Amino acid sequence: MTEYKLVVVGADGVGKSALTIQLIQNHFVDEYDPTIEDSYRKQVVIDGETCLLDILDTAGQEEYSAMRDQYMRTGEGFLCVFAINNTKSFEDIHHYREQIKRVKDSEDVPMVLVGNKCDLPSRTVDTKQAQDLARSYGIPFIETSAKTRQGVDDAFYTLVREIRKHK
Amino acid sequence: MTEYKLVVVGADGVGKSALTIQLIQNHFVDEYDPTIEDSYRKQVVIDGETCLLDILDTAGQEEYSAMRDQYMRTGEGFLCVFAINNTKSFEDIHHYREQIKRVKDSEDVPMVLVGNKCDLPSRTVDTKQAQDLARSYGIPFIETSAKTRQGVDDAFYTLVREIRKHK
Ligand SMILES: Nc1nc2c(ncn2[C@@H]2O[C@H](COP(=O)(O)OP(=O)(O)CP(=O)(O)O)[C@@H](O)[C@H]2O)c(=O)[nH]1
Ligand SMILES: Nc1nc2c(ncn2[C@@H]2O[C@H](COP(=O)(O)OP(=O)(O)CP(=O)(O)O)[C@@H](O)[C@H]2O)c(=O)[nH]1
Ligand SMILES: CN1CCC(C)([C@]23NC(=O)c4ccccc4[C@H]2c2ccccc2N3)CC1
Ligand SMILES: [Mg+2]
Ligand SMILES: [Mg+2]
């Protein structure tokens, strides 16, 4: 059974936990409970292959930024999440990508750019600007909603495909 | 900050995941999604001390019984869970206690016996029989409901107190 080590990263409040809980448990968490570090081991069928997904739901709080080095060394693919109504979270993406690239000493780390909270009308980051950034990195870009489940399966399955396509 | 490694063990279906998710997320999970291995970190105040709880939600499925060795070696305290409406789950408790005792090579391992699903009218295990088993082990016994939250905080806090006493 092929195991995929996925790490969900991004600024504090973008919806990393809500995305993960939506994927695994099929419901939306309305409450905001800041994460320290949670992990999930889930069996899924992707393109007819039984995959074991090891998902690390990380802290967005900068107080736990020293914890990053270890999960960036062990993680195989990174879901880089920003919120479409949070411009700072979109600017923070570059810092996460640079740190991952440094830790792995590689320009070709499996990554997917995720623009979460696409159900909200309060957009501050244009889809075209996020598309252009993902193109500059050579990575897929997907918009998601942890509330409606729009794009959630696609975001995680695309990351598994990036780890698989890189392999 | 004092860190406590808590491991939730017991038969497949007793409510290990629902107890853990209730404690951390204040949410009851009605669905049955068999666990492989999930972990959570949570900061809590117990008797005026800020505790970091590292909770391991383990597989009840006997298919993953080989995974027990590693978590029984690293775990500091064990929440041994049975369901009050499942006689077999109560019978399985002694196997978990024996395995933990063997791995640790000790009769004094921090443990709490938990009789879950106390909200259900379909009781098959008498509170007195469970109290007697906990007495034979020299451990606390608490009845809980992951649905109503009855005894949930008490079960986890008591386990932390047992680790503190052991130390
Ligand atoms: N409308 C909407 N709200 C969302 C979405 N995803 C998350 N939220 C909300 O945003 C808040 C933060 O979500 P959460 O999943 O805790 O984000 P996080 O990135 O894990 C926060 P931390 O970095 O501290 O762990 C919550 O109120 C949650 O309901 C979404 O797609 N749409
Ligand atoms: N009424 C009631 N139902 C509960 C309670 N705790 C768990 N359940 C239910 O029992 C079922 C199994 O719960 P779950 O948390 O998955 O048990 P588990 O021991 O983790 C199963 P596994 O060992 O395979 O991971 C679920 O349908 C859940 O809603 C409870 O206290 N009261
Ligand atoms: C992705 N993994 C990372 C490790 C994990 C967080 C872990 N924490 C550890 O410190 C540790 C260290 C060595 C082996 C096993 C463990 C686990 C463990 C055992 C007992 C109780 C809690 C618990 N949580 C589980 C999830
Ligand atoms: Mg979170
Ligand atoms: Mg479970």
Residue numbers in the entry:
A (entry chain A), B (entry chain B): 1 to 167
Sentences from the paper on this structure:
KRAS is the most frequently mutated oncogene and belongs to the protein family of small GTPases that function as binary molecular switches involved in cell signaling. Although KRAS could serve as an excellent target for many cancers, no therapeutic agent directly targeting RAS has been clinically approved. The main reason for this is the lack of druggable pockets on the surface of RAS. The shallow, polar pocket situated between the switch I and switch II region of KRAS (SI/II‐pocket) is of particular interest because it is present in the active, oncogenic form of KRAS.
The complementary “kinked” docking pose of 12 b in the SI/II‐pocket of KRAS encouraged us to generate a sub‐library of 1383 rotenoid‐like “kinked” molecules with contiguous fused rings from our corporate database for a second virtual screening campaign. After visual inspection, 7 compounds were selected for NMR testing and the racemic compound 15 showed NMR cross peak shifts. Both enantiomers 15 R and 15 S docked with conserved indole binding modes; hence, the racemate 15 was separated into its two enantiomers 15 R (2R,3S) and 15 S (2S,3R). Enantiomer 15 R was successfully soaked into the crystallography system with the crystal structure confirming the docking pose. 15 R binds to the SI/II‐pocket of active KRAS and forms two chelating H‐bonds to D54 with an N−O distance of 2.9 and 3.0 Å, respectively, and a weaker third H‐bond to the K9 side chain through the carbonyl group with an O−N distance of 3.4 Å. (D) X‐Ray co‐crystal structure of 15 R binding to the SI/II‐pocket of GCP‐KRASG12D. (E) X‐Ray co‐crystal structure of 15 R binding to the SI/II‐pocket of GCP‐KRASG12D in green overlaid with the docking pose in orange. Of these, we confirmed biophysical binding to the active form of KRASG12D for the tricyclic indolopyrrole alkaloid 9 b and the indoloisoquinolinones 15 R and 15 S. Importantly, we elucidated the binding mode by determining the protein–ligand complex structures of 9 b and 15 R with the first X‐ray crystal‐soaking system for the active form of KRASG12D.
